[PDB]
Symmetry: D2
Subunit: 319 residues, 4 copies
Amino acid sequence: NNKITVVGVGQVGMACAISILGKSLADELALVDVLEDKLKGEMMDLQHGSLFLQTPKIVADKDYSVTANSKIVVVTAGVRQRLNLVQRNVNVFKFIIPQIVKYSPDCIIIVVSNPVDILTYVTWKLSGLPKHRVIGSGCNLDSARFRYLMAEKLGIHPSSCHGWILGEHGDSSVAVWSGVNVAGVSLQELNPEMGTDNDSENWKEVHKMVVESAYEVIKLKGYTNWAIGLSVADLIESMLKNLSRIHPVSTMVKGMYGIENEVFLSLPCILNARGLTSVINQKLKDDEVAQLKKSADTLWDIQKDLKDLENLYFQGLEH
Amino acid sequence: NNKITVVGVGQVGMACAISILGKSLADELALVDVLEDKLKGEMMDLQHGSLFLQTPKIVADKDYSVTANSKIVVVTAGVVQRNVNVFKFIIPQIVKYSPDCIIIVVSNPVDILTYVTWKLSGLPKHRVIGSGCNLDSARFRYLMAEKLGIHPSSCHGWILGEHGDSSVAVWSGVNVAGVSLQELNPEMGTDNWKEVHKMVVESAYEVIKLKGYTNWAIGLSVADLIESMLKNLSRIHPVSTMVKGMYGIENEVFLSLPCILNARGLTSVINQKLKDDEVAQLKKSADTLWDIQKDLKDLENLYFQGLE
Amino acid sequence: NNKITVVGVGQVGMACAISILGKSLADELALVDVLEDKLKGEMMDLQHGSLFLQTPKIVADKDYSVTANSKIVVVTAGVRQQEGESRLNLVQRNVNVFKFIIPQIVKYSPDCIIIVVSNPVDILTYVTWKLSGLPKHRVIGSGCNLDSARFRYLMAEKLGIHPSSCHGWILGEHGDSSVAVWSGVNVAGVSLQELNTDNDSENWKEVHKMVVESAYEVIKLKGYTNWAIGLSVADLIESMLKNLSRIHPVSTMVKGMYGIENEVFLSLPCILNARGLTSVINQKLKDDEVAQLKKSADTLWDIQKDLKDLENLYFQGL
Amino acid sequence: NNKITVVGVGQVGMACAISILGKSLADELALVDVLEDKLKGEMMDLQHGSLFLQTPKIVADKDYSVTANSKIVVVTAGVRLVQRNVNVFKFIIPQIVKYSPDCIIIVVSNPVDILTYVTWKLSGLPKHRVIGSGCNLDSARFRYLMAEKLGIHPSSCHGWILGEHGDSSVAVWSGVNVAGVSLQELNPEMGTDNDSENWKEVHKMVVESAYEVIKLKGYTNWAIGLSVADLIESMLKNLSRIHPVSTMVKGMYGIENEVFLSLPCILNARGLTSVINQKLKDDEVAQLKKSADTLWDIQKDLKDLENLY
Ligand SMILES: NC(=O)C1=CN([C@@H]2O[C@H](COP(=O)(O)OP(=O)(O)OC[C@H]3O[C@@H](n4cnc5c(N)ncnc54)[C@H](O)[C@@H]3O)[C@@H](O)[C@H]2O)C=CC1
Ligand SMILES: NC(=O)C1=CN([C@@H]2O[C@H](COP(=O)(O)OP(=O)(O)OC[C@H]3O[C@@H](n4cnc5c(N)ncnc54)[C@H](O)[C@@H]3O)[C@@H](O)[C@H]2O)C=CC1
Ligand SMILES: NC(=O)C1=CN([C@@H]2O[C@H](COP(=O)(O)OP(=O)(O)OC[C@H]3O[C@@H](n4cnc5c(N)ncnc54)[C@H](O)[C@@H]3O)[C@@H](O)[C@H]2O)C=CC1
Ligand SMILES: NC(=O)C1=CN([C@@H]2O[C@H](COP(=O)(O)OP(=O)(O)OC[C@H]3O[C@@H](n4cnc5c(N)ncnc54)[C@H](O)[C@@H]3O)[C@@H](O)[C@H]2O)C=CC1
């Protein structure tokens, strides 16, 4: 079978669930949340439209037993957008991550909750699963937003546009301008001043707008959901169909790019049935690798004092 | 060539939008609403996922000039507490900008608002249709699949009449694998099968009681009607249409009937006997549109409004 | 791992493979054939289109090692009908071919669902079931799934609607003695049997004869039939690999049913999912339908009881 | 509506037809061929499977009156150095524009670069409506060879093969890249005789893989069938995607002759919106001019009574 579990019947979870059923990727959809009513309501609503889909079974319950033998588990629980956010979201992940592995040992966890980069490391610690099976959303949407900003810029489809945004999902995202190209035309060679301050084509602004556009939409409708459901389902299609496609997702970066701390950052990785086949370790400019080490230093700065990651009880360890 | 305009960016509004984009049906998505912030925010979110879709352009604006030359217009806007006051502002404007178009009314009651849309638009009958009992039929086929352990597609059930209660369920048409389920149980739907029919009616009431609104079930059915129409498949669907002169009905009412849907809209309606107890429920539906809309407000927007 | 193997790179086989890749039902497509050049030729030709497909691995080799751990095996190998040949004439030839390809499939794919396409499908599904040793719920034949597709299309152009909106069920033997259950023929729930051998409506019985003559006509025109059957095979695979639990008219074991007394494979409405054939709908047909249904089984076993290749011992009796 | 005509019901012809039906692109498929039996048999075969398709009408006839009001016409008719197809194109191309002038013609018959030019003259249609198969298939074969050696999906590794559809092709090594990194940057000897990875042999296999297919099974079928289906989808949906189709190169890259060469172009409902003028290297522009020089000499033997207007 192809069982997929969605922990979160909110705006991002339902957008993800509707994208899974729209792609016929799952034969058994499992919805898990803490709201009894909202959980049963979204399940029945999805079940009523099961005639127009190809997912026979759609089970949903608060007990994680309905998630048994799931291939992929998409975690969308928590609260939206700061050390406060990560402190309270790891509080939720502490009660749901160990329960997912208890019923779905051979699954692939997809962390969506923000901060993704941090919560993916939190998920990898409490789950005990290999790092190649714990993948986070990361900059898979940052590259989609960047590729769309270039689509309406040149007048072509985002498919023909190729722009890679890596690093940390947020303002500290790295824009590898050497890979920005369409139709095999490296635009960095047309404009050698790409990314710097003295740039005719302010690509620095369109790079910043990738983070702004995410912040803006949260001001107008109050959230973001559709761009992720399509991005999350796009990752599962690469994984379930064994396509072995390269995607910029958050992965264990320690030991790569001169970083020594156990953190998760977005990098190109191949996705098949097993999860992360390999993590592309390309060569970046001196300034691009600077943010990779700086953001990882800031990421580890938070996770090192996360007392929700306690594997042992000997915690008279006050400081 | 395949421009689709969705009026309303609410729950049902975006449910059809994400379902239309999930099917590569429209090369142009136009969203309209009164709340420009939610209207602009929802459009920008769908745009960020353009890489994973096959729609070149997604536009949105309060002005209806952005909905010009649309092949399909889905009306999902809505607030005796009827929605004609809102319909008088959203309907005359879509036809002004896209005359040659097809209308899919979704606001409740579907059978009532679809008639006001046809009157305010002046378009023919085949181009003004509503969801009707297409969702009630899908809900009914799921209950048969849940009890029989098969797929709703392999199941076959036809719910007609009004959207919700007072709906008709043809028991002679209920069948699976060609086997008429009424033949195995001659006393089907009579003194259990009527609860299954009433469960369709109350399956929605439970949804709004839990999550507060019906969302994805309707959005998927609207995309199913759009696919069968934009592809000229000429498929049969139980949509709400004008049924004057059929089954002893002599009033301009809109009821759910099995109709053929394609690029020209509602070309034909399926002729059926419906026994005798079922034919009455269609005439018993004289409380819809008649009795209700005979005390209408103003199904014609006039500039003389120094009123209140 | 949704691995699919296609035995036979002929017209029907290639039409099945192109339909499987079109729907992205398999992540690993294995091809097996005796013609090694054509086998390797069709592989590279399909592999060049990997850019527009969703199947990463496309392997092909005459040895059945490339078929290990296959979920569904579509068998299209054998000799083809020729002009005005009879479907019951290609038996001794394709049964001898099935003698060397069916056992080899189970050796490398013990847990798999075999789909028989080679004609006569009703006879060879029985030969496969006996040669493979797998349960009857996993040895499924094409049956009348295509016969119903051609029937529901003929009534589609007649009523001006889509074949999907049409609802017709053709059961029995795939070919001449097909049983057209007119009691189940309906459109939008309206059983079009309002008309009630002669008049029908205009002739709601020539359409059945057209389903039988359609196969011969296409063979007389282009020489074979591959596209129509190729799409029907993909429809059955989609119902299995996706656990759709949909009802299809496929050939299955029908003993005990309709008074049939000996092991015979006939087409009946069956529910297909990941487990294969999980249920068979036993309708209550008219006395004329069960008579033609049973008659098709009498002639079927008559040809199966003498086949000198399913002999596992040394039967020198003539 | 989205009517599509496929001229020729042969192997390559039916590979496209079965591909357009598998994507629900057109609502009416029209087949045209000279053989009555094969044309009618292939038509009824597709009609029998109408249940599993989203195509209502499927027609076929000898006269081109059945192809009236078509949006895209795929010309895959001819014979698999002696141009026996320009004679056949004389009797079929004018018939297409006579019953459906407002359309887009996709040439598939080989030599495409020679026949797409022949189509452009007989049809008299704008250059943005005459499409040739070009190196879009050569790019798919090239991207697969990169995926075969890297263990990834062909859609993840990007490569652009331009020039002629055949032996004299151009591999823009400056456009090859996987995961956003320039493969030429990793190995600067890409394309030269000092290649550490022998990429010139990979380019040679692209123009030789088609030879192997015709040697094993006798013809190339499904590779081109899926390629044309990808170009039609980028057009019928106005996706505005960049594809290396065969287009005119007169004026650009210094060629002052009217020839057709494979170059990346934006495909949408109109056909060709733009033709990318990539700044190629010296050895690449030389081949694009050397091939265009000899190709015009091939299409200078217009003494099959074409001789311009
Ligand atoms: N990586 C990305 O691109 C983005 C990530 N997100 C993430 O989605 C998350 C929230 O999902 P949203 O739909 O935006 O808001 P939401 O208010 O709908 O929260 C999602 C669900 O989590 C539930 N929940 C909280 N704790 C739970 C627990 N212990 N067990 C089960 N359910 C629990 C809530 O009931 C809710 O239904 C946030 O962390 C947010 O950052 C959303 C936008 C962008
Ligand atoms: N046909 C069916 O089976 C179903 C019926 N519905 C109907 O759909 C309608 C909307 O349902 P929801 O989306 O869940 O409520 P909603 O409040 O989330 O969306 C309704 C939309 O109307 C907009 N609106 C109101 N007046 C407008 C105007 N003059 N112009 C533009 N936009 C206007 C509001 O912005 C709103 O977004 C209701 O009438 C409801 O009864 C809901 C589910 C299924
Ligand atoms: N069940 C059904 O509904 C249908 C039945 N069919 C059947 O499909 C069959 C195939 O028709 P075609 O592909 O057009 O003729 P074909 O001449 O292409 O034969 C198919 C393949 O069998 C191969 N073959 C022969 N012995 C083999 C072996 N031992 N191992 C592997 N491959 C072997 C040949 O190389 C060939 O490529 C016919 O027997 C026909 O009756 C056709 C239409 C529908
Ligand atoms: N661009 C590319 O990469 C490809 C090039 N091709 C070309 O496509 C052409 C056909 O290839 P195949 O289908 O495998 O050979 P084929 O002999 O099977 O089909 C060619 C069709 O032309 C028909 N025909 C001849 N004159 C006609 C006319 N005046 N009107 C209508 N039909 C006519 C024949 O009946 C035949 O069916 C060849 O020229 C070949 O070089 C083949 C594969 C791909």
